[PDB]
Symmetry: C3
Subunit: 104 residues, 3 copies
């Protein structure tokens, strides 16, 4: 049943990653580039934490273990995957703001 | 299914309707901002938010059902519906960021 | 699991489409608009492959033909939904870069 903690740990870490990435984007918008870079570093860490749980989840099935699929679990997987997506495009927003500061 | 739709099977359709409209409002807003139509963009974002709220109502009921031990039937459509809801939230959140970026680009040139 | 090859195929096509789309963004970022545009055609071709799998998943179920639900399937659907959104917003980024070029 420890495996049934997977959804919670996914949501918690993914939300943390998503939060860091958006914070990074806001810093970049305000011209605080050092703070933006740091937040992204932290976002990368958080997505790593989340991935540990996703990997175990996928390998569990691969391994032949039966997993009771719930809405919560599906929702947890959406959190991680959307977090990865937010982080990837946030990096592009950050990069664009850096480009714009270069010109004045 | 096409032969018979159960009451529970209504949830995915409702989530897709509202989430889809949320995503549509967000993209409409993005497109407005791109044209320098900022007030129309701001208002479409409000409607995006409202549509996510309506979708969210079904979400809470769905999660809580499970909490009660009321096992939901997992289907492709339900998974897809969940994807759409979470997608709408992501699109709205980033479209906000496109809109702000378009406002900044106006502020300069 | 002969139908369980579909998740694998969804993941592969979607992942490649996402990569293609990101390639396009980086090209446009470098001022390489021809390469960007070409990268997006490839993204669209790969999205279509995965999308075709998904339409059949949804339609078959509507017909009463039940699919075996697994973590990998759910994962596969996440890959497509996010690939679609990345492609779509990468296109918005490409437009932003083209915009910045045109003004100078
Ligand atoms: Cl991982
Ligand atoms: Cl190529
Ligand atoms: Mg999903
Ligand atoms: Na960028
Ligand atoms: Na509302
Ligand atoms: Na359930
Ligand atoms: Na922004
Ligand atoms: Na754009």
């Amino acid at each position: 049943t420890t495996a049934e903690q997977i959804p919670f740990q996914l949501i918690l870490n993914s939300g943390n990653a998503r939060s860091f990435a958006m914070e990074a984007l806001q810093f970049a918008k305000q011209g605080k580039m050092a703070e933006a870079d740091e937040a992204m570093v932290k976002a990368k860490e958080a997505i790593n934490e989340a991935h540990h749980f996703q990997t175990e989840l996928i390998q569990s099935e691969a391994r032949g273990e039966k997993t009771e699929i719930s809405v919560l679990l599906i929702h947890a997987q959406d959190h991680l995957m959307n977090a990865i997506t937010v982080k990837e495009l946030a990096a592009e927003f950050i990069d664009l703001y850096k480009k714009l500061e270069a010109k004045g």
